[PDB]
Design a protein around this nucleic acid. Sequence first.
RNA 1: GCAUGCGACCUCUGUUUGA
RNA 2: UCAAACAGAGGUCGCAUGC
Length: 523
Amino acid sequence: KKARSYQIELAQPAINGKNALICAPTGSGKTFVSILICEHHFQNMPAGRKAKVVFLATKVPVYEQQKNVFKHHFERQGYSVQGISGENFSNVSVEKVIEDSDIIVVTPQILVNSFEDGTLTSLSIFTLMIFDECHNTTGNHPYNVLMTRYLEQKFNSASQLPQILGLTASVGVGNAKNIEETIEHICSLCSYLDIQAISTVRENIQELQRFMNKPEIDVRLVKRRIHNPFAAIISNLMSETEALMRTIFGTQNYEHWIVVTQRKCREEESRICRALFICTEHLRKYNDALIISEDARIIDALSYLTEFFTNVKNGPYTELEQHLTAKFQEKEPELIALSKDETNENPKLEELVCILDDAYRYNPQTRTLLFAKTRALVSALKKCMEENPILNYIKPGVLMGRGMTLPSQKGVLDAFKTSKDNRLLIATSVADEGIDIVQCNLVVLYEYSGNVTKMIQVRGRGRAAGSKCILVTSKTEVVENEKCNRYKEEMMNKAVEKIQKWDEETFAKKIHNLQMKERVLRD
RNA sequence: GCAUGCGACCUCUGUUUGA
RNA sequence: UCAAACAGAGGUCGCAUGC
Ligand SMILES: Nc1ncnc2c1ncn2[C@@H]1O[C@H](COP(=O)(O)OP(=O)(O)O)[C@@H](O)[C@H]1O
Ligand SMILES: [Mg+2]
């Protein structure tokens, strides 16, 4: 692992002391650049005043990952590298850990936290800050909260602040519909993080196209399976429950409307009150059951329901709770017969099955990441893997936050990198940024939509020459929005390539002009 | 529990072209 | 008045993540 020539090139503007943003493609080794910057920070430190470096990483696993690189590289040099975090925060006084540490890796919230906490009131304490996936500097996200602070202190003392460093493979594109606006948005981002130079692989492009490369995002539309009995059955069982509401579908809006009706109603009042807290719930859990089958199997939907109708007995189980539960159990053996179906299943799941086989026969040692939007879905997908004879080649893992333990995470990832047991990892948003599975080959998106940023960062989870990235939708708009992104992403690059062709003064001037939009008076 | 990003939804007030 | 488009201010909700 010898410094690459573009890596040393990207370094330059930061070593000349300037607040840099390092835009360089997903996987190019920006993290190395930042440690290289870090050596040339300690090296060059003037006087007796010495250096504290803080690396900030957005989500926990990325904090862990980067914390561990940084230790393995600087501890042997004889540096104190300590990681404060969500686990560590109410076990340590930040005060000390900084003054003990030459390098602190941090979840960004912690510094925010400890700033309101009193523990800390001077960003001056560090001499270099690094923001991994720095593009997250928006509105009231921690990064900006801290950076607002940084900017205030700039005027309120003009007495040395730390050097800033943004790493990002995805500078973004605001709402910019035109290249001119995309530039206004990028320049906006540079202002938030007080950038004075943007770093690009300018001169060493050829070297860069070697090491990391990217392809298309194979989009796959599957039409909703014609003849869907299950959808009709529940909708009617909901219609009869909506008919009964006056006497006293599978969309987001139905959930929104159920909460409209649950707040309005919150002893001819009191018996009608908790009558609608019985009507709304059943309608809601029917609704959730539709939308759970939308992606999963019917067997997951009916699971979700028996899990509710056996729970209707537990609590009150009043008159109405009996007349509704019974309406279901008449029409239940109809459904459990449909569970047992062969052909009539979600064709999104038929395609994934196809897709995973297509890749695990052609290459038996592939490592996939299957991304889904929601925990429930991610977890329900693990069931869909295990229980399918054609796909249980591979043990599947799951990655998450917590409603999964932070140690339980360390395990599944550490496993998935090198196990050759579980060669596929279903994950959620935690995994979509900054995370480095060297042996990862394929990344599959299961109704994983999104911003340009997401759909750049996610396909970049696929490393190691072997790269492929396959989406699976049934929706029109999702097939399009994503195409839309492939334009926005092209536009994004030019924005920068262009911005880069300005002179020092005029870029600098742009950022100040933008910052001056955010000052504060003193009297 | 709280925060944030993101998405859906709705409202107000204005500008555009249309009928 | 209607429809369609853009933008400024606000209300609610869902997901994910962070503390
Ligand atoms: N000069 C180098 N030579 C060989 N491997 C490198 C070099 N620099 C970085 N890498 C490796 O590239 C992989 C991904 O790097 P990373 O910096 O996380 O990508 P990103 O820039 O998207 O964050 C890591 O395994 C890292 O060790
Ligand atoms: Mg990185």
